[PDB]
Amino acid sequence: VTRNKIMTAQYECYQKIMQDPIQQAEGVYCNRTWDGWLCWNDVAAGTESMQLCPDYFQDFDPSEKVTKICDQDGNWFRHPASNRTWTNYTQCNVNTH
Amino acid sequence: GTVKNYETAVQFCWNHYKDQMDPIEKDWCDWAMISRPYSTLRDCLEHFAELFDLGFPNPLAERIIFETHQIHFANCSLV
């Protein structure tokens, strides 16, 4: 079920990444990407996209939010430690509240 | 052991995924028919990424997932 919800979410993200790229639209922004669990649409630089937490796991709260920063240079925020593109899922776990 | 690095790890995954998909050219746009090789390809690419201590997603992995979407799914809808 959960595996199904994830591969399905993933396949669609990529279908769009591949078949519905931002055309022309000059300026800077963050291009659509699959962070591994959630798909994120193209957004203008200096923005903070957000969504509800994936219904994937049971210790996750669908009511909680998920965040992802796209900076002014039009590049998705990378977490400083490994310096890989990063989505903030720190608020999804029920027991951390 | 054919996996000697992430490069070869990805080839291993890619070739095993291709072996699973070739016999079903007609069913490529059918989730019931592809969900397993596809889901199994994700697992392979991510499990070896862990094995070489790389994150997931990672560039080399996505390039491969980009590949299947080009050669296998470019003709299907978003389902």
> What values do phi and psi take at A77, rounded to 5?
-45, 135
Nearest to residue B73, comparing CAs of A42, A38, A20, A18?
A18
In CATH terms, the fold of domain B1-79 is DNA polymerase; domain 1 (1.10.150)
- List all residues 6 or more positions away from B57 whose beta carbon is below 8 Å from its beta carbon: A34, A35, A36
Nearest to residue B72, comparing CAs of B40, A6, B64?
B64
Please indicate whether, in this complex, the C-beta atoms of A15 and B78 are within 8 angstroms of each other: yes
Chain A CB contacts of B66 under 8 Å are: 14, 17-18
> What values do phi and psi take at A44, rounded to 5?
-75, 145
Nearest to residue B43, comparing CAs of A33, A55, A57, A7?
A7
**Separation CA A29–CA B20 (nearest Å):** 37
Domain that holds residue A17: 1-97
3-state secondary structure of B71: helix
**Separation CA B21–CA B29 (nearest Å):** 11
Chain B CB contacts of A10 under 8 Å are: 42
Domain ranges of chain B: 1-79
CB contacts < 8 A, A to B, total 40
- The number of helix segments (H) and strand segments (E) in chain B equals 3, 0
**Separation CA B69–CA A14 (nearest Å):** 7
Please indicate whether, in this complex, the C-beta atoms of B73 and A11 are within 8 angstroms of each other: yes
Q: Taken in order A57, A51, A93, A85, is the CA torsion positive or negative?
A: positive
The total number of structural domains in chain A stands at 1
> What values do phi and psi take at A42, rounded to 5?
-60, 140
**Separation CA A38–CA A12 (nearest Å):** 10
Domain CATH for A96: 4.10.1240.10
Structural determination approach? X-ray
Three-state SS annotation for A30-64: ECCEECCCCEECCEECCEEEEEECCCCCCCECCCC
